[PDB]
Structure 1
């Protein structure tokens, strides 16, 4: 018999299976389509979710009640120290899909990226890439041969770049190494750009502009094993139900004599790989700026860091990206920032953003001062100050 009353189903079938991500680093499933006319530029970057903050902004949206009126918005900070190019990979079109043909590494690799290849670094002889480094013996003709192979045969060129995690407050010493597709120009141009950038740093300023819409690739917050009521948002059973109420009452009809895949079951929650799209870049701050959090209206000599630092992160002392809203992942998560896959001409996307003020009160409590100087001015001298 039919349901007495119709209702939409709980949860999406487009995000099954709700299992843990295979890797903690989010991987870019798809890169922006390559346009030969454009200049050779990267398409993705790796940063670290520092924390959330608050901004104030005059909304520029004609026809809205908030047009030319201040809006308070949540923002997320992504600590993005420059990435180091260490390798280049060539991909060949085949009837069975893209296939990596050749990988060429840089002559010298930093220790933090060589740790990536070790599960027990402290007990190793640290032999990684030693013979390969020797392959640069005064002529590097093997490297040139591989680069010529990539130029001749490859159709997609990606660059192997790693983060400089030692510049972040994280205690992890392994760098994060990822493939970033290179767009623009011919394959020869892409390989020349990759070779000319070995062991060099690339900053976010050369990848992302302000007011851009970008995508965020990350693994969400884990919650462990979870019941159907919170995992799927189903209705709790009445109070007087025997054997408990945080269940789904009927998990199927008699026929099919099986449990359907579309029925909500308890299982692992969170820690899923997610791609979130259309996040506006409110700010691209520089680590060398001593007034990161200062705007054209709040000239306070102020960094992006709140009072007491970011809770469970530390301080953002590097170049950073300030994005609108929330992104998947937790604090300290490595986050992949990708360029938009399509051209959005909507007013929300083409808007120019000018920030009025950035919140730097302590996140560790009901903070009520933006700066220690402000705190002292408001409170006066304390007993510890003498």
Structure 2
């Protein structure tokens, strides 16, 4: 018999299976389209999510009801250290996909990615890339042989980079390695651009910019073995039900004599590699610049770091991308910011917004003061500081 009242299905079948992923670094499933006329630049970037804040700005949307009126939005502050190039990877188009055949590393790698390659840095002899340094000891016949194949084959080129974790207040002290595909034209100049950038850092002053709809790829905050009501959003059973009310009722019919793959069943919620798209960048700040939170309307000397620092993270002493809306992933987690896959023109993109007030009140409690100089002026003298 049919349903008495038909209802939409709880959940999304295009996100099954909901098992755990491989690593905490979410890999990039797709890079933007290669253009032959654009200059050679990076098309994705890796950062660390650090806290959120509420920002007052002006809505530059004509035809709306709050045009030229202050609105507030919630933004995220992803951390951005200097990121250095250590490797070049090529890929030849085969009839079974892509295939890497040459990966050329750098000469003097840092101790961050050397710690990545070992599971026990305290017992290891630290002998990684010691016989690889013998390649750089000769004239360079074996060095340019590996790059001449990239100048001939390997139509698409990806670049191994890693974040400088020692400029980041995390307690990990071990860098994350990832691939970034380059969509600049003249594919022979791809490996010629990254040969000069061996042990040379890459900032976000040329990768990203102001007023840009970008993508975000990260791993969902885990929640362990979660029950079926909070996982799928199932309507709860009444109070009178024996042996369970926070469950799902009967799974299916008699025929087929199995459990279908589309019913709501209990299992892992969290730790899912997701991809959220269309996020707007509001501010790209410098690390050495005093008063990163200074606004042209505000003109005061204060940074984006709250009073007492960020919740469970610390302080920002480096660059940062200040992007619109909630980004997937939790605090202290690696997150890959990606360029847009298409030219967005939908009247919410290409909007030249300008910030007005950047909040730096404490997120550890109820924020009553922005700067500690404002707290000393409002509260006055106390028993201490004498």
TM-score (normalised: structure 1) = 0.99
Structure 1 residue matching 2:24: 3-state secondary structure: coil
The answer to whether structure 1 residue 13 and structure 2 residue 8 are counterparts is no
> Aligned partners of 1:26, 1:165: CA distance in 2, in Å?
18
> Aligned partners of 1:57, 1:362: CA distance in 2, in Å?
20
The answer to whether structure 1 residue 251 and structure 2 residue 257 are counterparts is no
> Aligned partners of 2:142, 2:278: CA distance in 1, in Å?
43
Structure 2 residue matching 1:159: 3-state secondary structure: strand
After TM superposition, give the deviation of residue 141 of structure 1 in Å: 1.9
Q: Deviations over 1:185-242 (max 9, x none)?
A: 2211111011111110000111001111111110011000011100000011001110
Structure 1 residue matching 2:205: 3-state secondary structure: helix
Q: Which residue of 2 aligns with 1:98?
A: 98
Structure 1: give runs of 5+ residues left out of the alignment: none
Where does 1:112-123 land on structure 2 (aligned, <5 Å)? 112-123=112-123
Q: Which residue of 1 aligns with 2:108?
A: 108
> Aligned partners of 2:174, 2:140: CA distance in 1, in Å?
28
> Aligned partners of 2:128, 2:91: CA distance in 1, in Å?
24
After TM superposition, give the deviation of residue 384 of structure 1 in Å: 1.4
> Aligned partners of 1:354, 1:63: CA distance in 2, in Å?
19
Q: Deviations over 1:320-362 (max 9, x none)?
A: 0000110111101101000000111112111012000111000
Q: Which residue of 1 aligns with 2:79?
A: 79
> Aligned partners of 2:137, 2:90: CA distance in 1, in Å?
23
The answer to whether structure 1 residue 181 and structure 2 residue 181 are counterparts is yes
Q: Which residue of 2 aligns with 1:37?
A: 37
Structure 1 residue matching 2:14: 3-state secondary structure: helix
> Aligned partners of 1:129, 1:118: CA distance in 2, in Å?
12
After TM superposition, give the deviation of residue 280 of structure 1 in Å: 0.1
Structure 2 residue matching 1:42: 3-state secondary structure: coil
Q: Deviations over 1:89-138 (max 9, x none)?
A: 11000000011010001111000111110000111001111111121014
Q: Deviations over 1:238-270 (max 9, x none)?
A: 011100111111111111000000000000001
Q: Which runs of 4+ in 1 moved over 4 A?
A: none
Where does 1:258-273 land on structure 2 (aligned, <5 Å)? 258-273=258-273
How many pairs align?
A: 386
Q: Deviations over 1:159-186 (max 9, x none)?
A: 0000001111001111011100011122
After TM superposition, give the deviation of residue 33 of structure 1 in Å: 1.0
Where does 1:63-78 land on structure 2 (aligned, <5 Å)? 63-78=63-78
CA contact under 8 A between 1:32 and 1:43: conserved in structure 2? yes
CA contact under 8 A between 1:101 and 1:150: conserved in structure 2? no
After TM superposition, give the deviation of residue 140 of structure 1 in Å: 2.3
After TM superposition, give the deviation of residue 19 of structure 1 in Å: 1.1
The answer to whether structure 1 residue 127 and structure 2 residue 127 are counterparts is yes
Structure 2: give runs of 5+ residues left out of the alignment: none
Where does 1:1-386 land on structure 2 (aligned, <5 Å)? 1-386=1-386
> Aligned partners of 2:100, 2:349: CA distance in 1, in Å?
35
Structure 2 residue matching 1:29: 3-state secondary structure: coil
> Aligned partners of 1:77, 1:55: CA distance in 2, in Å?
12
After TM superposition, give the deviation of residue 83 of structure 1 in Å: 0.8
> Aligned partners of 1:255, 1:275: CA distance in 2, in Å?
37
> Aligned partners of 1:161, 1:141: CA distance in 2, in Å?
25
Structure 1 residue matching 2:131: 3-state secondary structure: helix
> Aligned partners of 1:206, 1:60: CA distance in 2, in Å?
25
